[PDB]
């Protein structure tokens, strides 16, 4: 039985490829899809973060919808402590990236009257007044609900829908006036304190970057984070604002725009152009637009990001049930698998790792599934179609990448080794979706941390001093990658690898491609 | 904005098709994917069943893992009372099929402390003894557990793993005995009464069709059920055994083989050949094989069923969170959509409708997602590859079906109308995956109920007597489909449909095809 | 602006769309990839005419040993080499010219009647092996010299006489005679050729004369042999045997000439260095309306294998007497290039016709246009698919380099190679851009003409002590040749394939390099 779904890889049609998928075809050791974990009370201790890393976490997400700067600074400190506890062994060290996820223009309710834990039942057909009068800030109940969007009355009409608490409760505006709204409960439920509110179809006029966001973004620069997940990006100008706040000192932090509302989907092309990457933020997105349509936005967005070679993250509720249970549902395993087959560069966990009872088991399950799905891609067709979509470009690095991926397919190379300081060369290899892992050797630590955004890039930090001669400095970094591949079981002596280097120190990209036996 | 993802439909590559999927592109009214609902305490009343049918239920599944004949007989009676409550308006009446899901070779534990509702806690590392001594079948506790697989000692070895309660708890055998097994708790949890046991990698020698199964199958014949879902089918001879029990009296009942263990996957080709259809039974499957591999067998099974033209059902945990919540997770939305995109003829609900708090909402959600996903198929490529896979066959009805589908693509027909008594001609059209609905007019009531197994066949029962002139009997039945299509909003006057009919009374299949404007 | 090189058609999605986009106003590139093989004879064998042949595009000089003495052919070869080396003054413009020997091959011939006799349809005719009649052939009795004929023909079989003019049907079989009913009549002369359509002829692979002529080719240091009438792998093995140790590097091109050769093609191809579709004799053996089937089948399977394939015979036939070809002949050349032929050939057009240089020049012009009109992206995909069972390392370099050449529209692929193997593997994957193969082996350079797209460049410089210097020197030589011939100019991009170390064994290093 061929490994790595290689029988299916030889099919002539998508249907035949599907019919050849084999549960007894073992996947390879390397996992190409990056795993992003939201750190929270369930996973922010150093002891647990170490296990998070060993289980496969590549990026730690800090969710600034909650928490003080002091709280997040401590979480970040613990991540770095956990990560550096492994720098003893340079060959086995895994870099770990740090992401800041902005609050953005959120609408929330106030506190339920009584003591903190209270909940009121919103009954179907009952009426409920929404007020903006701060007098009710802390005495919400089933008759009057306060929220913090002072302009809501300007952007909703009679008939508008208001969704509350992750979309579980839906209200219809029956009467307006300024300072308040009268609504009817359509879908009831129990309501607690400080729940999120969505206004689908309304034109919310809160700023993309608020005063709080600016402070959090400045805090992110001071904490040396690697990337920002920008909430509720609606237009390119929103992205430009975030980049301005990060300014000169933060110019190398990647901006990932979260698509989570209708306008974001409508203006997707211009948002992608302006961004370093994209997150399919399915939670809000499935409230803002009909839930049955999210898969359409997900597949469209992943495809266009693959087309452009920009990282795309699939997020939210992938293993939701594992917040309470140690194994996922069948829908959840299928969801992770299909995000990988869709082409997602990374997959994400939120409550599963932030507050769940089984954060490690959830990480491990994403690792297992991603590997199975990675072998099940139809690489030959994917490569042809990606080459087609980019054939207007004659860029020399793209040519080097395509020739290298094509060579790697032909001789079934165990890996592609790429020497890069900005990461650009390795990003262009990943964009053409080789089957084998890309071992990217860099002396630039930020480049290594940010490489987890790209499917298949296994970053390796070189800490050796620069050698006197270029040939020796190149050979030094190539053999580091050989030793890393061996130690992790990506390949053994006598396997074949593709090696991409610069001919001279002044080559501006990896213009040299070799097919090399592993020593 | 073209409707029905028709812009994506005009794409040259899969990637381009993905990039063109548009959440603002309206799907058509008709939903092609059948919906199978498990009936239970939450869905068993006549009044609830009427809403189930209005929400989109096409097949009622009776799960014979539980309940007496008297109980299921009453359920079937209610389903038919509900169904026939709509016969007053023949143009809108919808056939509902009844399916019998066998218990099969299940393994179950006994009663905790004599109680159906009691639970004990199994802690990791504790000892736990499995006995077969019937003295303990109602005296399970945290020290001693009874189960009903008499030969379990024969088929398991020291070291073998044992899974309990939908695989949530795991034990490892440490010592064997004549009628007991001493084990250690590996994955702990709370253990209730009469829970399922799985023995992955064990030569379980239970009959495929037990003495209880034989009773249930003959009860199914008496109750005039339309189909049998056979549990744990391992090989073609298992199907033959089921077909034998159903006998001559039950020869027209479709046998759907449920694939839910490793052997069923390995022997799938012989099982498909012997079965009328297949169910991907993902619950047990993801316990019998590694859960991260289930998507592989799902896609392989659906593809091979599509190839053969035989109905395939995707089942289990598709909308699992809706047992307790009024809207699904994002993984559940994605799971349903991807099953439809894989090619599943039917999707199923189990706990969501048998016992959940939101059975109607679950059915409506499957309906909405299916419609969206059916338009998002890549019909032109699917047709080419289906045709390629079956090109060794020169069957005349396949020729008519492929020509009719091709014609329906070319002129964007609103429907295909197919006159059939056995269903065969309509099934051959369904197999080549038209975009438009297939209105199958038949005078055989059972053929109409069984048509729900096939993607896109909307059955219509003609109750008029056979006209003495063949041409007029054909016209009467085609005009019936015209009126039903108009009343249901599948098309309007001036739309175009493909019409498949027999040239003479003795034609054995629809050898005549016309393009016809709707009057 | 109109894209050159049929690059608009190149971007098409389907073959039909590619066809609909071919553009008479889209100019081809300067470099011509399809080799031209010219038969040298009385019309073309003076040194001064051979100089013009080379200038006009000839890559391979074919000597047809169906006629002429060793002395005659030795002088022709000498004239070819005298003409070739007259350009060796300038190493940047020197073109290698290869020498090919085409064997007479085994034959079946009739006896004597210069008398002529008319056979009439429906008449009876007896074929005898009795030497009594060897010089007494007439209306009723015909002698021929193939003494095993009765072993290989059946009742109902056909016997063709004089390049297919006469056809007979076997009605009765004797132990040493055949009675036949003349189907196609005509006038029958003396010592005429006989063909046995569909027969498994047991004639030797090489005749006595062929053995003498092959040994002569080894003494003359020819680059390749065109072996007539190859019917099975054992025929090719026999030719390699006669070439012996001194000629073990001479390439053997098998000529497919009859039914058995087509039917056993796979085994012949495995055993041969290359293939010639010998359409003249082929169309006498099989029905003329089926030759294109065999031609396309053979070119396809040779392409699949990466072995050279030549399209031969009557391509520009009318130019024997006329200074311009017919439209059927223009089409025929273009379609052979589109089919995938590595080389196209001229026989009488250059050996004896009135317009030998005109024919060479027309083949050159047609090939450049047809080379641009191939559907490279599809061809590459289909060649990749057919060879995907192989994981060979040099194919992977070839495929990645050709792929890189498509993506960045490289002006050329530069390959350093001593055996040529690395360049052959690049040619096999059909880049659009020319392949400049720099070699210090003069025979590799002459033999490279058999492969589509390889422009051989002979390096005459001593080996530099430092490997990096030796590689630079040879890459620069190719840079200089490319600029002088107008294949590229400063600022263009080329793919360069080299060995990492002297012992690398193949070109395991690929670079994208700007033209300096
Ligand atoms: K956030
Ligand atoms: K780089
Ligand atoms: K069951
Ligand atoms: K029928
Ligand atoms: K000859
Ligand atoms: K070589
Ligand atoms: Mg959000
Ligand atoms: Mg089951
Ligand atoms: Mg001949």
Numbering used by the authors:
A (entry chain B), B (entry chain A): 12 to 530
C (entry chain C): 11 to 123, 128 to 530
The authors write:
PYK catalyzes the last step in glycolysis and is present in all domains of life. Many PYK isozymes are homotetramers (left); a few PYK isozymes are homodimers. In most isozymes, each monomer comprises three domains (center). The PYK ‘A’ domain is a TIM barrel, the sequence of which is interrupted by the ‘B’ domain.
Next, we summarize a comparison of 61 subunits from eleven rM1PYK structures, which were determined under a variety of liganded states and solution conditions and can be compared to the H/DX-MS data. Side chains and backbones that showed >3.3 Å shifts were noted; the majority of the observed changes were >10 Å. Our rationale was that the differences among structures reflect the minimal structural ensemble, which in turn gives information about dynamics of this protein structure. The B domain appears to serve as a lid to the catalytic site, which is located on the top surface of a TIM barrel.
